[PDB]
């Protein structure tokens, strides 16, 4: 009906929708940003402040990617790490900072 005729004809629509089925359907097939967010296909769209977005070993992947790449962001990361989950976040932040005033701070 709604989603009926939806997939019928069948991306912001996709957005609301979720907001893999037809999902991963058109999937393989920055609003996109937010979406992939809430959402692996998300991983993909990702890899495609957007860093803040992406904020999974492949996450670590695109990570060291733009890492050596670029080689604000720092501040944001630190704030997020300061705001299981906790442990992971902390570790990641430390690794990034090591790869430093505010550091020891």
């Amino acid at each position: 009906s709604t989603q009926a005729v939806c997939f019928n004809l069948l991306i912001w629509a996709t957005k609301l929708t979720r907001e893999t089925v037809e999902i991963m359907t058109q999937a393989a097939l920055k609003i996109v940003m937010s979406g992939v967010m809430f959402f692996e296909n998300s991983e993909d769209e990702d890899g495609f402040k957007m860093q803040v977005n992406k904020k999974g070993k492949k996450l670590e992947n695109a990570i060291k990617t733009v890492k050596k790449k670029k080689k604000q962001g720092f501040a944001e990361k630190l704030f997020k790490e300061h705001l299981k989950f906790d442990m992971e976040q902390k570790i990641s932040l430390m690794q990034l900072l090591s790869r430093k005033l505010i550091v020891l701070g």
Binding site: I11, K30, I31, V32, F48
Partner: protein
């Protein structure tokens, strides 16, 4: 000679410089027809969701010889019998597999794509594949084949900040070529995503094929 009759640091209106006119009639000495290099500045991004996938009208032809590949099955081949350049059935898809390749832009549909996928490894060169870009996978072709014979502006997926396609030549008629360039901007400006940056106009650059270019704002 040809440089002193052109401007590089001075902007002009469409009624001053070229922009599909005839100001390069005495400039271009060669009798061979040239192409319109209408360049445009439009800052975009690297997002696949941000792009124009339409088709410009362009009423007046560009005066050129071309040939398309008409091939349909089921019953659509009967409707496309009068307006066609070649038959090309289902069993005639193995003819171009040899050495003969006198087919430029072949047109098909979405129904006959199970066998068309075998022709893709040979016809992957020129940008004319069947996807979601250029309008092709569709059962309708009666009121579409009569349009492609009027020389349609084939829009492609460009990404560098330089934006230029193909208008015409500029040697047919004065006032006739004026109402042609009015669709090369109207369609482009129509498809404007909110995710884009700054403006979409920028600077307008128009040239020929040998002579210097200009600048329009």
């Amino acid at each position: 000679m040809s440089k002193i009759t052109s401007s590089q640091v001075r902007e002009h209106v469409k009624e001053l410089l070229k922009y599909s006119n005839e100001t390069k009639k005495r400039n271009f000495l060669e009798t061979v027809e040239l192409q319109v290099g209408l360049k445009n500045y439009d800052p975009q991004r690297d997002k696949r969701f941000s792009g124009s996938l339409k088709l410009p009208n362009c009423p007046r032809p560009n005066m050129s010889i071309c040939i398309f590949g008409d091939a349909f099955d089921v019953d659509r081949a009967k409707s496309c019998g009068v307006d066609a350049m070649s038959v090309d059935d289902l069993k005639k898809l193995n003819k171009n597999k040899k050495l003969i390749k006198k087919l430029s832009k072949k047109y098909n549909a979405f129904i006959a794509s199970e066998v068309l996928i075998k022709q893709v490894p040979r016809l992957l060169g020129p940008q004319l594949s069947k996807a979601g870009k250029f309008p092709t996978p569709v059962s309708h072709n009666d009121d579409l084949y009569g349009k492609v014979t009027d020389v349609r502006s084939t829009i492609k997926f460009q990404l560098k900040k330089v934006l230029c396609l193909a208008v015409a030549v500029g040697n047919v008629e004065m006032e006739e070529d004026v109402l042609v360039n009015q669709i090369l901007m109207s369609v482009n400006f129509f498809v404007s995503l909110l995710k884009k940056n700054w403006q979409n106009v920028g600077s307008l650059v128009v040239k020929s094929s040998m002579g210097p270019a200009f600048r329009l704002y």
